[PDB]
Ligand SMILES: C[n+]1cn([C@@H]2O[C@H](COP(=O)(O)OP(=O)(O)OP(=O)(O)O)[C@@H](O)[C@H]2O)c2nc(N)[nH]c(=O)c21
């Protein structure tokens with residue numbers, strides 16, 4: 219197993235309301251876990267526990283190795299689009315190009331005369347929300363890691379572009395990698411190896427899409 223939570227409960231504030239309550243799941247190496255639930259359900263807080271930023275008050279957690287995290291809030295730093303995606307990791311042309319194709323960024327980049335050297339974050343280009351989201355996702359996917367934590371990464375995308383990038387990036391390009399994707403979309407839940415739906419900190423459902431259909 220690469221990631222396990224067993225009977226996990228946690229609090230952000232000593233003696234507040236628990237942000238996660240008796241949570242259970244397991245992901246084997248290379249699988250995809252979909253994490254769903256309404257705002258404030260605890261999805262980002264669950265990822266923070268995996269990243270060691272929130273400690274359990276009850277229960278056990280297993281994970282090892284390097285993490286790459288994609289925030290639900292896209293961001294860019296001053297530098298070229300290539301520098302933003304590689305973000306300090308060593309460069310490889312094939313890997314970089316594979317990521318930007320999987321993220322549909324090749325189309326955007328081909329329209330600038332400076333191509334991958336277009337400068338972001340310095341008052342020239344103002345990117346759209348969807349462009350900034352795809353760059354943020356590409357940054358997280360380019361990094362080599364044992365576990366990818368993708369927190370609602372499809373912000374501002376129309377539903378067909380979201381579907382296409384889910385399929386080319388999260389399912390195909392990342393097929394061999396352990397992934398946790400925070401997402402609400404039916405096709406993502408259907409393609410995941412497991413689904414965890416959170417509601418106000420609790421496990422509303424944990425199992426497969428097939429199991430849920432049989433209910
Ligand atoms: C991300 N985060 C959330 N909280 C609070 O933890 C509770 C669960 O908040 P959440 O951010 O985990 O919910 P979720 O990611 O499901 O919501 P969404 O992104 O809108 O879809 C809420 O009370 C937050 O205010 C947080 N509280 C502290 N103290 N530190 C944090 O980093 C933090």
Ligand SMILES: [Mg+2]
Nearest residue numbers: 261262263290
């Ligand atoms: Mg969140």
